[PDB]
Write an enzyme that holds these catalytic residues in place. Structure first.
Site, PDB file in Angstrom:
ATOM      1  N   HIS A   1       0.826  -1.202   0.000  1.00  0.00           N
ATOM      2  CA  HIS A   1       0.000   0.000   0.000  1.00  0.00           C
ATOM      3  C   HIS A   1       0.863   1.257   0.000  1.00  0.00           C
TER       4      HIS A   1
ATOM      5  N   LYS B   1       0.212   0.233  -9.810  1.00  0.00           N
ATOM      6  CA  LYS B   1      -0.141   1.201  -8.783  1.00  0.00           C
ATOM      7  C   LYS B   1      -1.527   1.759  -9.072  1.00  0.00           C
ATOM      8  CE  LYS B   1       2.321   4.762  -6.197  1.00  0.00           C
ATOM      9  NZ  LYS B   1       1.521   4.465  -4.976  1.00  0.00           N
TER      10      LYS B   1
ATOM     11  N   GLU C   1       7.501  -1.391 -13.796  1.00  0.00           N
ATOM     12  CA  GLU C   1       8.403  -2.531 -13.887  1.00  0.00           C
ATOM     13  C   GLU C   1       8.318  -3.391 -12.631  1.00  0.00           C
ATOM     14  OE1 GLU C   1      12.407  -1.258 -14.061  1.00  0.00           O
ATOM     15  OE2 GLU C   1      13.267  -3.236 -14.471  1.00  0.00           O
ATOM     16  N   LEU C   2       8.071  -4.686 -12.824  1.00  0.00           N
ATOM     17  CA  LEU C   2       7.986  -5.635 -11.721  1.00  0.00           C
ATOM     18  C   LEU C   2       9.377  -6.152 -11.374  1.00  0.00           C
ATOM     19  CD1 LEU C   2       5.777  -7.090  -9.953  1.00  0.00           C
ATOM     20  CD2 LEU C   2       6.075  -9.031 -11.505  1.00  0.00           C
ATOM     21  N   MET C   3       9.757  -6.021 -10.102  1.00  0.00           N
ATOM     22  CA  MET C   3      11.086  -6.401  -9.636  1.00  0.00           C
ATOM     23  C   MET C   3      10.947  -7.458  -8.548  1.00  0.00           C
ATOM     24  SD  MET C   3      12.550  -3.650 -11.255  1.00  0.00           S
ATOM     25  CE  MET C   3      14.091  -3.526 -10.378  1.00  0.00           C
TER      26      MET C   3
ATOM     27  N   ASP D   1      12.977  11.909  -0.924  1.00  0.00           N
ATOM     28  CA  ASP D   1      12.590  10.764  -0.104  1.00  0.00           C
ATOM     29  C   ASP D   1      13.473   9.559  -0.411  1.00  0.00           C
ATOM     30  OD1 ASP D   1      11.245   9.491   1.897  1.00  0.00           O
ATOM     31  OD2 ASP D   1       9.352   9.250   0.811  1.00  0.00           O
TER      32      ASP D   1
ATOM     33  N   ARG E   1      12.894   2.122   2.000  1.00  0.00           N
ATOM     34  CA  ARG E   1      11.527   1.704   1.712  1.00  0.00           C
ATOM     35  C   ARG E   1      11.115   1.998   0.274  1.00  0.00           C
ATOM     36  NH1 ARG E   1      11.507   6.222   5.055  1.00  0.00           N
ATOM     37  NH2 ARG E   1      10.540   8.084   4.129  1.00  0.00           N
ATOM     38  N   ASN E   2      11.762   2.962  -0.381  1.00  0.00           N
ATOM     39  CA  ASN E   2      11.421   3.357  -1.741  1.00  0.00           C
ATOM     40  C   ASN E   2      12.376   2.774  -2.780  1.00  0.00           C
ATOM     41  OD1 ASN E   2       9.266   4.935  -0.740  1.00  0.00           O
ATOM     42  ND2 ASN E   2      10.640   6.680  -0.413  1.00  0.00           N
TER      43      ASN E   2
ATOM     44  N   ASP F   1       9.891   4.685  -6.338  1.00  0.00           N
ATOM     45  CA  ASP F   1       8.738   5.467  -5.913  1.00  0.00           C
ATOM     46  C   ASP F   1       9.110   6.941  -5.864  1.00  0.00           C
ATOM     47  OD1 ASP F   1       6.993   6.842  -3.663  1.00  0.00           O
ATOM     48  OD2 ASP F   1       5.849   5.090  -4.324  1.00  0.00           O
TER      49      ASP F   1
HETATM   50  C1  J3Y Z   1       6.526  -0.501  -8.563  1.00  0.00           C
HETATM   51  C2  J3Y Z   1       6.962  -1.872  -8.117  1.00  0.00           C
HETATM   52  C3  J3Y Z   1       6.639  -2.474  -6.899  1.00  0.00           C
HETATM   53  C4  J3Y Z   1       7.216  -3.706  -6.875  1.00  0.00           C
HETATM   54  N1  J3Y Z   1       7.151  -4.637  -5.835  1.00  0.00           N
HETATM   55  C5  J3Y Z   1       7.586  -5.916  -5.927  1.00  0.00           C
HETATM   56  C6  J3Y Z   1       7.379  -6.579  -4.751  1.00  0.00           C
HETATM   57  C7  J3Y Z   1       7.715  -7.977  -4.399  1.00  0.00           C
HETATM   58  O1  J3Y Z   1       7.931  -8.218  -3.226  1.00  0.00           O
HETATM   59  N2  J3Y Z   1       7.801  -9.017  -5.274  1.00  0.00           N
HETATM   60  C8  J3Y Z   1       8.154 -10.352  -4.758  1.00  0.00           C
HETATM   61  C9  J3Y Z   1       7.171 -11.394  -5.305  1.00  0.00           C
HETATM   62  O2  J3Y Z   1       7.093 -11.272  -6.726  1.00  0.00           O
HETATM   63  C10 J3Y Z   1       6.588 -10.009  -7.162  1.00  0.00           C
HETATM   64  C11 J3Y Z   1       7.576  -8.916  -6.731  1.00  0.00           C
HETATM   65  C12 J3Y Z   1       6.772  -5.583  -3.841  1.00  0.00           C
HETATM   66  C13 J3Y Z   1       6.333  -5.613  -2.516  1.00  0.00           C
HETATM   67  C14 J3Y Z   1       5.799  -4.471  -1.975  1.00  0.00           C
HETATM   68  C15 J3Y Z   1       5.708  -3.319  -2.755  1.00  0.00           C
HETATM   69  N3  J3Y Z   1       5.171  -2.156  -2.212  1.00  0.00           N
HETATM   70  C16 J3Y Z   1       5.008  -0.953  -3.039  1.00  0.00           C
HETATM   71  C17 J3Y Z   1       4.103   0.045  -2.316  1.00  0.00           C
HETATM   72  C18 J3Y Z   1       6.349  -0.314  -3.315  1.00  0.00           C
HETATM   73  C19 J3Y Z   1       6.494   0.499  -4.423  1.00  0.00           C
HETATM   74  C20 J3Y Z   1       7.726   1.083  -4.676  1.00  0.00           C
HETATM   75  C21 J3Y Z   1       8.774   0.825  -3.802  1.00  0.00           C
HETATM   76  F1  J3Y Z   1       9.990   1.373  -4.013  1.00  0.00           F
HETATM   77  C22 J3Y Z   1       8.554  -0.001  -2.713  1.00  0.00           C
HETATM   78  N4  J3Y Z   1       7.366  -0.538  -2.507  1.00  0.00           N
HETATM   79  N5  J3Y Z   1       6.125  -3.313  -4.008  1.00  0.00           N
HETATM   80  C23 J3Y Z   1       6.650  -4.393  -4.576  1.00  0.00           C
HETATM   81  N6  J3Y Z   1       7.887  -3.864  -8.044  1.00  0.00           N
HETATM   82  N7  J3Y Z   1       7.706  -2.701  -8.801  1.00  0.00           N
END
Ligand code: J3Y
Length: 277
Positions: free
Chosen positions: A26, A44, A91-93, A141, A145-146, A162
């Site tokens: 979130h 998002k 982008e999914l990481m 920021d 966390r970001n 972020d």
């Molecule tokens: C934009 C984006 C987000 C993201 N993402 C990948 C997660 C992950 O744990 N994965 C393991 C299992 O497989 C799938 C990938 C993950 C977990 C929490 C999260 N929270 C959001 C609020 C967030 C946004 C930006 C930021 F810098 C930190 N957090 N985002 C996650 N990838 N790309």
């Protein structure tokens, strides 16, 4: 926003080719999704229950992230504004966020991370911050966390993921001229990166551990700085303290920080240091 760019220029991907597999985190929820052979993305969301400023906050973020082109900054795959709720495709990481990664890969009886791995994560973020400073963008920021990681194994790449605070407070991450004067320059990010360096080498600890916000305010303003993380080497801690110089005119730019991070990588007495457990 200009980096020159309008909502004109985003890639509007139709909602028909989008669905959300699972929830990730979130302000506003963020999920993992698919698009189109399938393409795996992070989505998002702007909650449909929102105000007017929430709308121009949400798109604001979309044009800013879409104007970036750097390997250490999360890519913007697409955008879905014409369908409620409005989406931002990112982008999914698979490595997850940085603060969780370091606290979960904290060594324990095992040989999870060496210090060379953390120097790579710090330089990955420092190179992304150098791209922002060179293009005159202030993040406001820079925190663990970001930050996100492509994968959990060796060869992971850290990326800033972020831009929530860069709309237009994280007291523990901001220099004195920020929380007291409201001034923000590229040297404000230099201070925050120094706090991020401490987060990395403490392996996910909360900076100023047992201090609340105003305690940090009076502690930092009076000249106080954090102690080195457990087992942190000399040259690394000197980068943190050089980032925490009171006058922003004496903190280094991100080209100098990148060089000093490079030299610690070239130091066997640094990379052979054992992480605690
Ligand atoms: C934009 C984006 C987000 C993201 N993402 C990948 C997660 C992950 O744990 N994965 C393991 C299992 O497989 C799938 C990938 C993950 C977990 C929490 C999260 N929270 C959001 C609020 C967030 C946004 C930006 C930021 F810098 C930190 N957090 N985002 C996650 N990838 N790309």
């Amino acid at each position: 926003y200009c980096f020159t760019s309008s909502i004109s220029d985003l890639k509007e991907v139709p909602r028909k080719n989008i669905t959300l597999i699972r929830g990730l985190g979130h302000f506003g929820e963020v999920y993992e999704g698919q698009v189109s052979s399938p393409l795996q993305v992070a989505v998002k969301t702007l909650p449909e229950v929102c105000s007017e400023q929430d709308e121009l906050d949400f798109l604001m973020e979309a044009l800013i992230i879409s104007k970036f082109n750097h390997q250490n900054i999360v890519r913007c795959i697409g955008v879905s504004l014409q369908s409620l709720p409005r989406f931002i495709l990112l982008e999914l990481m698979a490595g997850g966020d940085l603060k969780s990664f370091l606290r979960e890969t904290r060594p324990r009886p095992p040989s999870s991370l060496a210090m060379l791995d953390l120097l790579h994560v710090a330089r990955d973020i420092a190179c992304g911050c150098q791209y922002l400073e060179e293009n005159h963008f202030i993040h406001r920021d820079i925190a663990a966390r970001n930050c996100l990681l492509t994968c959990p194994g060796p060869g992971r790449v850290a990326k800033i993921g972020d831009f929530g605070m860069a709309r237009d407070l994280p007291v523990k991450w901001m220099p004195p001229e920020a929380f007291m004067e409201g001034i923000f320059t590229s040297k404000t990010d230099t201070w925050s990166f120094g706090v991020l360096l401490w987060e990395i080498f403490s392996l996910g600890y909360m900076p100023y551990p047992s201090k609340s916000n105003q305690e940090v305010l009076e502690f930092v303003t009076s000249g106080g700085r954090m102690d080195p993380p457990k087992n942190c080497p000399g040259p690394v801690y000197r980068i943190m303290t050089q980032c925490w110089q009171h006058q922003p005119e004496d903190r280094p730019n991100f080209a100098i920080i990148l060089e000093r991070i490079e030299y610690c990588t070239q130091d066997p007495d640094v990379i052979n240091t054992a992480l605690p457990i």
